[PDB]
Design a protein around this motif. Structure first.
Motif, PDB file in Angstrom:
ATOM      1  N   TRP A   1      56.229 105.720 138.568  1.00 23.80           N
ATOM      2  CA  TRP A   1      55.506 105.950 139.810  1.00 23.80           C
ATOM      3  C   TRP A   1      55.191 104.610 140.400  1.00 23.80           C
TER       4      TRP A   1
ATOM      5  N   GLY B   1      52.926 112.243 143.729  1.00 24.77           N
ATOM      6  CA  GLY B   1      52.190 111.472 144.723  1.00 24.77           C
ATOM      7  C   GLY B   1      52.068 112.146 146.063  1.00 24.77           C
TER       8      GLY B   1
ATOM      9  N   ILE C   1      51.828 107.026 147.514  1.00 26.68           N
ATOM     10  CA  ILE C   1      52.186 107.077 146.102  1.00 26.68           C
ATOM     11  C   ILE C   1      53.455 107.880 145.973  1.00 26.68           C
TER      12      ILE C   1
ATOM     13  N   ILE D   1      44.422 104.682 139.901  1.00 24.82           N
ATOM     14  CA  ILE D   1      45.449 105.699 139.886  1.00 24.82           C
ATOM     15  C   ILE D   1      46.057 105.587 138.514  1.00 24.82           C
TER      16      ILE D   1
ATOM     17  N   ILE E   1      53.686 102.638 144.429  1.00 27.76           N
ATOM     18  CA  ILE E   1      52.719 102.703 145.503  1.00 27.76           C
ATOM     19  C   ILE E   1      53.112 101.661 146.532  1.00 27.76           C
TER      20      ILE E   1
END
Lengths: 116, 116, 116
Positions: free
Chosen positions: C109, C81, C41, C92, C111
């Motif tokens: 954000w 993260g 993350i 999340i 991933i």
């Protein structure tokens, strides 16, 4: 893979990528980003234990003009970096308050392209 | 890919790589590095909430003889590891101040080779 | 590769994977994990400098119901993260104490799946 690492002594900038490259070295400890993407910056500062000059202890990691990491601990080896989405033209630089605060034979930082 | 993970219960060391392997298990919670490269260490310590023995709370991650991470928080789940360039012969070990400070059914650490 | 990123403005959820996907968007800033694996993350919170409302400054990253990261710094850009082994059904989420504590044009954000 595209990656680059500066140091430790005797090495300066070491590079490995395909063409076109994802980064290019600017000068000692400083790199420019040539491709947009997700990078992992890594490395370590080994602080010189017998450092006794007047400059306070600090090592700073820069993304462009902004500090992204400050290392303040004169005793322990501390990791540099983290995960950063970076853009074309960005620079990354590692700056020492005094070149003698640190053991350059055990101090380095590098970068790897994780994804576009 | 080359990777290894210890725990959580019921598992001990689990491994997956090609030959030759990049790591080999030494003993519970302890691994040796067999190839130079860039690794990501990961995992979590789940602290036992009802821990009431005399030993203070601490979990330590070792690279060779040196602590590289100390976990001091008795309440929250905390991540272990980070990014480390590692060399042949290096060990990584996770050490608990008391085996009961921690919930081994939700405590583990692992490693993945990112690059040479 | 399997990856997803929310923001920054103008973007909301952006995704790229093969079929079957490793994640699916739940709603703004919130994702569900569809495959077991090792994820990274990443992202950043850019705090609004002229934030003057009564809500204290805090940004929280959630794994399921548990906070996994708290960001408390009103001045500097801070990374979100780390590395997490995640399971099917996990969520999340990134939650702001006030939508105005933060600059959504420079806040995001994402991933990436690293391994199974």
């Amino acid at each position: 893979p595209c990656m680059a690492k500066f140091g430790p002594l005797p090495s300066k900038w070491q590079m490995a990528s395909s063409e076109p490259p994802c980064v290019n070295k600017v000068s000692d400890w400083k790199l420019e980003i040539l491709q947009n993407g997700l990078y992992l910056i890594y490395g370590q500062v080994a602080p010189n234990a017998n450092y006794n000059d007047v400059a306070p202890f600090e090592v700073r990691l820069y993304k462009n003009k902004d500090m992204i990491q400050t290392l303040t601990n004169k005793s322990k080896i501390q990791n540099v970096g983290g995960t950063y989405e970076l853009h074309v033209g960005d620079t990354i630089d590692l700056i020492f308050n005094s070149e003698h605060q640190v053991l350059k034979n055990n101090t380095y930082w590098g970068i790897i392209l994780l994804a576009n």
